[PDB]
Amino acid sequence: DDLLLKLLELLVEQARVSAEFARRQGDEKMLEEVARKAEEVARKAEEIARKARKEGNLELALKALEILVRAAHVLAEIARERGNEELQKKAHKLAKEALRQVIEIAIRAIQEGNLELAIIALHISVRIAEVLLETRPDDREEIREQQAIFELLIAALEAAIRLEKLKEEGAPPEQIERVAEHGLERLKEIAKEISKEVDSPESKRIAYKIVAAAAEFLLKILAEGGATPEQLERVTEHALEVLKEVAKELADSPESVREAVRLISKLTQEGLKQLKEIGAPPEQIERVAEHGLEVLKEIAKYGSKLTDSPELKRELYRIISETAKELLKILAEGGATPEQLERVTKHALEVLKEVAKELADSPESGLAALAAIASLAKLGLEQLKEIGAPPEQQRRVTKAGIEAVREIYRYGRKLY
Amino acid sequence: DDLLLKLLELLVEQARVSAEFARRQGDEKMLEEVARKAEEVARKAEEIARKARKEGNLELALKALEILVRAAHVLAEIARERGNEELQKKAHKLAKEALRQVIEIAIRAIQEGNLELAIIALHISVRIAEVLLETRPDDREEIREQQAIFELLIAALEAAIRLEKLKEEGAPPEQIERVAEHGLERLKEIAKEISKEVDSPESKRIAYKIVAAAAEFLLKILAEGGATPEQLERVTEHALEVLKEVAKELADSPESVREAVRLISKLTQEGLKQLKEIGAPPEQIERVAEHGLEVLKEIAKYGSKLTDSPELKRELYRIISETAKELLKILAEGGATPEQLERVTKHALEVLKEVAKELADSPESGLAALAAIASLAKLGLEQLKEIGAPPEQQRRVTKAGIEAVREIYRYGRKLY
Amino acid sequence: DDLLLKLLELLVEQARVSAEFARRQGDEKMLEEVARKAEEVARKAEEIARKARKEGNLELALKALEILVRAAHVLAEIARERGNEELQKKAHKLAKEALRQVIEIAIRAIQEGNLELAIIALHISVRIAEVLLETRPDDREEIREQQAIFELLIAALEAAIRLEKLKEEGAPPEQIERVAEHGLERLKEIAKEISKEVDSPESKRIAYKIVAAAAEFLLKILAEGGATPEQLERVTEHALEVLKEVAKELADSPESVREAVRLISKLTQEGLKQLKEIGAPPEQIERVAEHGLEVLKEIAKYGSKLTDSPELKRELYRIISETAKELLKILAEGGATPEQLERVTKHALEVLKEVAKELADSPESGLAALAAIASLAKLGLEQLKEIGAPPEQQRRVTKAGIEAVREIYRYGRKLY
């Protein structure tokens, strides 16, 4: 592929030189034709960039974005002197989209755990900032949002590199966890200040996603560092608590709540999977599971306060049920006893019951939630079946399931 | 070697920085001294560049050209603000020589087929264009000729990179052939429009060389791709036809014809070489040989109608005869039956006779043509002897030789 | 590692782009905040640069310096529009310190033989020159000193790369020596002209260090080139002689003598190491030893005119004695006869006596000179003991030592 990108660079640079020449000559027809070439080059680059995004070669994607930056610069240089607002609109929107895509790449680079790609991407984002700055210097809010995003990314990167070097240097876990907490606290404070600054929904969405990625990166490097599970658990709980606080600030929209749950659940699941891989005693696993479910429930409750969509409620509840199913599957893969599984299953059902009691407001949603509860009970009983649990355990869980179903039906009879 | 080039770079940059300083001081003596230093640095670079050209390291030559470009930039920048026309004339001429050399390198990069070298060369050609643009705001025509050349190189690269990828992807040879034709026909019509747009004989020479190289590359990549001989033959005809059409526009000077036939001969030689290498039946080879020879004949005629020089006529005859002799020698090395050898020998004698009938205007040119015909007969008889052909075939050939020589004398009898 | 500095690059770029935005907006508060941030970035960079200097990774050191120069550039670019003096004062001082450090690294890179590091250092020096030039274009003497240093480095590097090439080519050592001699003579004439231009003690100190390093490099490359010991000795004499000339021209301050002596001693040591490793006859070693000591005494004699510092005189005598001790150590490691040991030891005592006669001016300085020659006598006797020289040789040397002490006491009786 690289030849095509290099050709597009050659083309776009030629378009720049031809445009500077055409500006010296006053040739509006050449300017029009190179503007067409520049748009078509940008189209070729965009089409290739989506292909690179599909295949996951970040270097090519970033290079394609740099071509898009260069093409935007040429288009903007033309649009500036021509006064053509449709070119200015196109370039500005393309630059916004590039900023979005490079931010997504930056999040992905953090998620994959190589910081050099993120740094390069962030450099390209500063080029995007230069293009944006020449495009619209009066949108101080966009600039400041990009700066906030950048500042957060830099803060995350500073913690990331510091931690990565402490790991490579073989530092004592006590120093590491003090640094990690200081990182989380600083990130939280920065995010909290950013939440005072900004009002773009997408900026907040991005911000929380970055924070979540920063917590996940900490989790990854800390876990690869091989620290004793007690430290992993303590950092995890602090991270979940921070994530809950920062969500309680930043989340106030359909997508933000849905994504916040998706993130917190993902990070919970990841952390529990790390505890499973290190071979932690099930007591710690169960504490993380409960504390995670409690946090999730508190978030679900918080998010629900604004709500008017049964559809969002349905998907949220579905995600909560998927979370419970995943949690039980992790304990089962972890070789947990049926008595640990029933304790967890009971708490999970009780959380589901409480979350249904918060969320539910129609018979239709009541049925859907009930069906989810029932499906969880089915999977839970299927775990007890797979471990060959005594019939009393099966009866206990089944009765609890029936009782929860009955109580939710009593609430359903109040709603209907 | 590169350390010397690197010192020359930093010397150039120090000349730039010291020239900023000297302008800020008003130190005309320092400007004179650093201008001498920059000329001498350029002289070192020019000698090293010609050394690199002799050794065939394109990277060194290109880097040395970039040094020459940077050196020219500072020289021209000083000369412009000084009003020094001798330095301005030196810089423009040197930059034009650099443009020639980079174009030749770009053609060589197409010939060697590593398109990354062609990309790097093309990038340096953009740098040449930038310095030229800062040199000549007035000669927009020369700049536009360079742009046309660049656009042709770009078109060639679009075909080249498309084809390279299309064969990396292992596509149907027929789909490849449709793309290759679309490349050639687009290139040809572009070249025709370029032939209207430009007027420098050398620019047209360059353009034709590029077109020839584009066909040559397509042929080489297609043949290395293992496409069946029918595709090679079809493309070869189309390529010859293209070369013929563009030559019929461009054949306005002695060396233009000489080059045109040389390039047609090259394409023909590569054609037979690939048909030999793939193991095609001599049936295809002999058809292509006839095609190439008759195109050559019609071009040789056409160029002769546009021209008068005795030495050109002599050279054209010589080249045509050497071409025919080499093509017959290739067919004989290709192991074809004696029948194909005599068929081609007869056709070649007829071509040479027609060429004599077009060219000949002095007893000396008659004798030279006769001597060439005799040399062709000698080589033909030598190949019939080496394959051990029946004596009747040998006699048939020498009789045809005498008959041709008789007809040459019957023409010459009008002049003598 | 590098990523830390890359974050600093991002912060620098961000500081620039935000400061250009803040200049479009009139945001004095942002300018103040980013200026503080840029100073803190420079603080981070300075500490990292000290760490790199300690670890001796020159690639990192040069990277860190370049990024420091970038940080200085943005700091100055902000301070210029602000009209702030203290930032300009800081930047100018820091840039001079960076120039000093990069020059030291350039000397070290000449020592470590990979001239690409010296080229990168030289590139950074040109970047420093741009920063200095945009900082204070009226401080022309500093710029001209940097130019003199650059010119000297260029002269050295041109000889260096020429020798590297002739050595790699396998040129006859006589031609290499002719080139090296011409290099040294050219370097001396340059150093003379530099000494006619400059008056900064540090500039002369740097200059002489560079000259000494150039001779040292020439010696090392010629020795690696396998030249016969006679050529090494002839070059060594020319080197000592030219080092003496340039030292005498440049030196008018205390540490300059101490360093000059140290450098001459180093070049003497390196020469003796070559003759020892190649297995030269001790006759050549004894010539080099005498010639070095003779020159050292000429320099010590010259230097004695410049100051009354007792500490300096004691240091010079100390270094002279260390030189004699090292010379004996090398001669003994060379397996030379007790006759060579007495020949050299006698000269060593005598040149020490001359050095005492020139330098000493007090009872305390007499006792120091005495103490040193007595220490030399102790080592000399220890060498004659370790080689197992016959008691008569031990006694002959011991009496000569006592007589040197007697002569020193004859002077001591006039000093007290």
Q: H/E/C letters for each residue in chain A? A: CHHHHHHHHHHHHHHHHHHHHHHHHCCHHHHHHHHHHHHHHHHHHHHHHHHHHHHCCHHHHHHHHHHHHHHHHHHHHHHHHHCCHHHHHHHHHHHHHHHHHHHHHHHHHHHHCCHHHHHHHHHHHHHHHHHHHHHCCCCHHHHHHHHHHHHHHHHHHHHHHHHHHHHHCCCCHHHHHHHHHHHHHHHHHHHHHHHHHCCCHHHHHHHHHHHHHHHHHHHHHHHHCCCCHHHHHHHHHHHHHHHHHHHHHHCCCHHHHHHHHHHHHHHHHHHHHHHHHCCCCHHHHHHHHHHHHHHHHHHHHHHHCCCCCHHHHHHHHHHHHHHHHHHHHHHHHCCCCHHHHHHHHHHHHHHHHHHHHHHCCCHHHHHHHHHHHHHHHHHHHHHHHHCCCCHHHHHHHHHHHHHHHHHHHHHHHHHC
Calpha distance B151→A271 (Å, rounded)? 57
Take residue B39 and report the two structure tokens written for it. Answer: 């000329």
Calpha distance C240→C288 (Å, rounded)? 10
What are the CA-CA distances from residue C404 to residues A137, C348, C369, C412 (Å)? 85, 11, 11, 12
φ, ψ for residue B336 (rounded to 5)? Answer: -65, 160
Calpha distance C400→C384 (Å, rounded)? 14
Resolution (A): 6.4
Q: At how many degrees (to 10) do helices B173-197 and B229-250 cross?
A: 0
Residues belonging to chain C with any Cβ–Cβ distance to chain A shorter than 8 Å: 3-4, 6-7, 9-11, 13-14, 17-18, 20-21, 24-25
Take residue C237 and report the two structure tokens written for it. Answer: 């004499």
Place of tokens 């050529």: C231
What are the CA-CA distances from residue A226 to residues A111, A176, B138 (Å)? 19, 11, 70
Contact at 8 Å (CB) between A385 and A395? Answer: no
Identify all chain A residues contacting B143, using CB atoms and an 8 Å cutoff.
Answer: 21
Transcribe B307-338 into DSSP letters: ---HHHHHHHHHHHHHHHHHHHHHHHHTT--H
Provide the greatest CA pair distance for chain B. Answer: 92
Contact at 8 Å (CB) between B124 and B66? Answer: yes
Take residue C369 and report the two structure tokens written for it. Answer: 């000179």
CA torsion sign for B137, B141, B142, B144 is: positive
Question: Hey, what amino acid is at A297?
Answer: K
Identify all chain B residues contacting A13, using CB atoms and an 8 Å cutoff.
Answer: 123, 126
CA torsion sign for C5, C7, C8, C13 is: positive
Give how far A48 is from chain B: nearest CA, Å. Answer: 14
Calpha distance A123→C6 (Å, rounded)? 10
Calpha distance A154→A119 (Å, rounded)? 9
CA torsion sign for A264, A270, A272, A275 is: negative
Give how far C126 is from chain B: nearest CA, Å. Answer: 6
Q: What is the DSSP letter of B83?
A: T
Q: Is B383 exposed, middle or buried (0-12, 13-18, 19+ CB in 10 A)?
A: buried
Phi-psi region of C56 (alpha: psi -120 to 50; beta: other; left: phi over 0): left
Please count the helices (runs of H) and the strands (runs of E) in chain B: 15, 0
Which ranges in C56-84 belong to alpha helices (H)?
58-82
Give how far A168 is from chain C: nearest CA, Å. Answer: 11
Interface probe for C, chosen from B1, B2, B3 (most Cβ of C below 10 Å), is: B3
Cα R_g (chain C), whole angstroms:
26
Provide the greatest CA pair distance for chain C. Answer: 93
Identify all chain A residues contacting C33, using CB atoms and an 8 Å cutoff.
Answer: none
Q: Residue A61 contacts by C-beta under 8 Å, 6 or more apart in sequence?
A: A49, A52, A53, A101, A105
Take residue A217 and report the two structure tokens written for it. Answer: 């990166």
Taking an 8 Å cut-off on Cβ atoms, the answer to whether C129 and B14 are in contact is yes
Question: Hey, what amino acid is at A42?
Answer: A
Taking an 8 Å cut-off on Cβ atoms, the answer to whether A6 and B133 are in contact is no
Q: Which chains touch C (3 or more CB pairs under 8 A)?
A: A, B
Taking an 8 Å cut-off on Cβ atoms, the answer to whether C123 and B10 are in contact is yes
Q: Is A226 exposed, middle or buried (0-12, 13-18, 19+ CB in 10 A)?
A: exposed
Take residue C115 and report the two structure tokens written for it. Answer: 């001239």
**A18: closest chain B residue by CA:** B147
Interface probe for B, chosen from A10, A33, A74 (most Cβ of B below 10 Å), is: A10
Interface probe for A, chosen from B102, B116, B117, B126 (most Cβ of A below 10 Å), is: B126
Place of tokens 């320092």: B30
Calpha distance A196→A249 (Å, rounded)? 9
B304 CB neighbour count, 10 Å cutoff? 18
The three-class DSSP label of residue B59 is helix
What are the CA-CA distances from residue B328 to residues A85, B17, B371, C46, C175 (Å)? 66, 63, 18, 75, 55
Nearest-CB residue to C126 (from B3, B6, B14) = B14
Take residue C250 and report the two structure tokens written for it. Answer: 């440049």
Contact at 8 Å (CB) between C72 and C98? Answer: yes
Taking an 8 Å cut-off on Cβ atoms, the answer to whether C3 and A161 are in contact is yes
**C37: closest chain A residue by CA:** A151
Take residue C260 and report the two structure tokens written for it. Answer: 């000059």
**B17: closest chain C residue by CA:** C130
Calpha distance A88→A76 (Å, rounded)? 6
Q: Which long-range contacts (CB under 8 A, 24 or more apart) does A16-23 make?
A: A16/A70, A16/A73, A16/A74, A16/A77, A17/B126, A17/B129, A17/B130, A17/B133, A18/B147, A19/A74, A19/A77, A19/A78, A20/B133, A21/B133, A21/B140, A21/B143, A23/A81
Calpha distance B29→B42 (Å, rounded)? 20
CA torsion sign for A365, A367, A372, A376 is: positive
Taking an 8 Å cut-off on Cβ atoms, the answer to whether B7 and C119 are in contact is yes
Calpha distance B155→B144 (Å, rounded)? 16
Take residue A278 and report the two structure tokens written for it. Answer: 């290190």
Contact at 8 Å (CB) between C225 and C180? Answer: no
C-alpha B240 chain-centroid distance: 14
Nearest-CB residue to B119 (from A10, A18, A25) = A10
